[PDB]
């Protein structure tokens, strides 16, 4: 009974691999060889946001690229004014073991979650001026790892129970559920068109999900370890993945295979966070060796190293306009990096 | 402009004051992680020590001993795989490990679980408080003798009771009960350095001194960590 199904699955996998190999007209390195290298890139800490007690496990930038929300393991959700370093809010969390945070595009809502399996949404825009829990979502058995906002009414959530769910603010119910993974889903990123999103789990694979339809589009393989962080390239037509094998891979929605592998022999620490710049040329990825390396998305070269952190970096985010990058770490400090002409 | 900046500065000052006020509260409490298999009586020791009080996924238990706040966290409705969320507990004072010593089948699984925790890169500076629960069950099993240890641990035949052992009781039960203790000690010291140490304790289903042992071990961990900062030890 199961033998025929296994044989059919193996044949389908072989056909998919053959189709992917046939489509490999060339590689990114050959076409990018005749391009100007990015060269050395210098990053200097402009602002140092201090005040968190425990390690930071997640941060997110606002639409205005001025207010950022940081989540730490002491149960505090602090919103920072990056321009003036002032703390505009300090939201105490019911559970200290938080793992993710999200800022709504409108800026009136902020979400967080962790081992409690509870996605707590806070209404920042209130008349009394005191932040309160808008509602709580309880539908995921596994630990909550990531959460992102589609709009003021819809939120996409990634859990560690190999499932992804989409919720609504009005009723707090799962409109759709994505069940196609075999490992813990760590992080997910929403494409700019907001039509579809991609995610990566603890199975060395990534799946592209359709929000409205609710079914997986394509799957991606090639990584040797669990996928830790995922980001969408600006054009929304590609995404990058990071794993514990000290290697970052780039995937394309049309080629359905890896584009270019970013790795170094010296680097042996896994990835914790990854994000792209405004133009997408600069790829910033977290690492467990207490620093962040800027990777050229085309030439696959280390443009620079962000070695201003004592402990390993867990989160990093780039502003909407690309003005500055904020890299959180386990040293309870947030660093804002920028260049100079 | 000036008024808005002054208001923002005042709000930041208030937030910083709240953070400073809540720093002492955060530092006072000692975070603990409770781990163990299904056969281990984690719930028994959770309910027995709950008398010291001051879907879900993770449970929180708060108990006070000697006017010291102690918060321990027990993982509930979570998946079997634990290589990812275990990194969140790197800052805990100690990790409480409950082992069923009266099974002889899951004991190897407990040994493998100890190997993963001890050799974890992030769980390298955390001392492990070993709780050998169900020692009453180990004692009765030894006397009747249907199930032995040699068939599961061949080296038990050549094992000898250590001189430093202090039996509280026929020689058979203490020889086997200390043999399991020797197995756990040798695994902890096989590759672990002086950064962290394993504290083994003998636990039953009716003992009420488990909270005292945790407080004593946590105090020792804090004292050793202070000495490590001073580079004296």
């Amino acid at each position: 009974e199961l033998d025929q199904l296994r044989q059919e699955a193996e044949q389908l996998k072989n056909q998919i691999r053959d189709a992917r190999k046939a489509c490999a007209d060339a590689t990114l390195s050959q076409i990018t060889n005749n391009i100007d290298p990015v060269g050395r890139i210098q990053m200097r800490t402009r602002r140092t946001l201090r005040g968190h007690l425990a390690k930071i496990y997640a941060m997110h930038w606002g639409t205005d690229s001025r207010l950022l929300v940081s989540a730490s393991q002491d149960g505090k959700l602090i919103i920072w004014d990056s321009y003036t370093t002032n703390k505009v809010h300090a939201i105490p969390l019911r559970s200290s073991w938080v793992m993710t945070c999200a800022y709504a595009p409108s800026g009136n809502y902020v979400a967080c979650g962790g081992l409690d399996n509870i996605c707590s949404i806070y209404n920042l825009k209130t008349r009394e001026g005191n932040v309160r829990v808008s509602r709580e979502l309880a539908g995921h058995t596994g630990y909550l790892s990531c959460c992102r906002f589609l709009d003021d009414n819809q939120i996409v959530t990634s859990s560690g129970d190999t499932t992804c769910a989409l919720w609504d603010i009005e009723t707090g119910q799962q409109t759709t559920t994505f069940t196609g993974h075999t490992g813990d889903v760590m992080s997910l990123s929403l494409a700019p068109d907001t039509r579809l999103f991609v995610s990566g789990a603890c199975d060395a694979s990534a799946k592209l999900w359709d929000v409205r339809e609710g079914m997986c589009r394509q799957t991606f393989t090639g990584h040797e370890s669990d996928i830790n962080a995922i980001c969408f390239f600006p054009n929304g037509n590609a995404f990058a993945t990071g794993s514990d094998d000290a290697t970052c891979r780039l995937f394309d929605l049309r080629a359905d295979q890896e584009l270019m592998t970013y790795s170094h022999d010296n680097i042996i620490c896994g990835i914790t966070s990854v994000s792209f710049s405004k133009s997408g040329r600069l790829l910033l990825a977290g690492y467990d060796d207490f620093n962040c390396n800027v990777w050229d998305a085309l030439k696959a070269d280390r443009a620079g190293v962000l070695a201003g952190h004592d402990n390993r970096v867990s989160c990093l985010g780039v502003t909407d306009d690309g003005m500055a990058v904020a890299t959180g770490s386990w040293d309870s400090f947030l660093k804002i990096w920028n260049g100079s002409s | 402009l000036s008024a808005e900046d002054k208001a923002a500065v005042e709000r930041s000052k208030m937030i910083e004051k709240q953070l400073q006020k809540d720093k002492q509260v955060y530092r006072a409490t000692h975070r603990l992680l409770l781990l163990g298999a299904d056969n281990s009586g984690k719930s028994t020791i959770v309910k027995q020590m709950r008398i010291y009080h001051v879907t879900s996924g993770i449970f929180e238990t708060k108990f006070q001993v000697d006017k010291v706040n102690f918060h321990m966290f027990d993982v509930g409705a979570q998946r079997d795989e634990r290589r990812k969320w275990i990194q969140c507990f790197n800052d805990v004072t100690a990790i409480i490990f409950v082992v069923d010593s009266s099974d002889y089948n899951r004991l190897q699984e407990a040994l493998n679980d100890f190997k993963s925790i001890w050799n974890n890169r992030w769980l390298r500076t955390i001392s492990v408080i070993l709780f050998l629960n169900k020692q009453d069950l180990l004692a009765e099993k030894v006397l009747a003798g249907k199930s032995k240890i040699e068939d599961y641990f061949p080296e038990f035949a050549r094992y000898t009771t250590p001189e430093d052992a202090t039996p509280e009781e026929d020689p058979r039960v203490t020889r086997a009960k200390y043999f399991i203790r020797d197995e756990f000690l040798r695994i902890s010291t096989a590759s672990g350095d002086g950064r962290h140490y394993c504290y083994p304790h003998f636990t039953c289903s009716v003992d009420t001194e488990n909270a005292r042992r945790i407080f004593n071990d946590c105090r020792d961990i804090i004292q050793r960590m202070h000495l490590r900062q001073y580079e004296l030890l």
Partner: nanobody
Amino acid sequence: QVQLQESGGGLVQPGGSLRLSCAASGFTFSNYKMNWVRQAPGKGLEWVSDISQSGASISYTGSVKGRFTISRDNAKNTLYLQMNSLKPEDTAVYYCARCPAPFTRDCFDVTSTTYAYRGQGTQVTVSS
């Protein structure tokens, strides 16, 4: 795609000897520690033995200590497990498992019900 294909097993008289091999692809064999686990019928998965990246550190469980020999071939990217003098309680499904992360000596979810880095396994049966 990371996959493991166990080869070997079959019907062997008790007290006999058989050799089974683990094929690996899609990852660096040398950089990843490899383990051997067992799942007896009516029982959960249990650990048997593991081999280090270079083979310097080798360990076995007490139940099979001094009975099985594990060999690791980095050049041939395959894991070997030689067994002799079997027992009637040794019949089970032998699963070839890989540690989740490289360059680390800790492997947490190797003996997991729904582990991802493990093969389909080969049934071994011993009986008179």
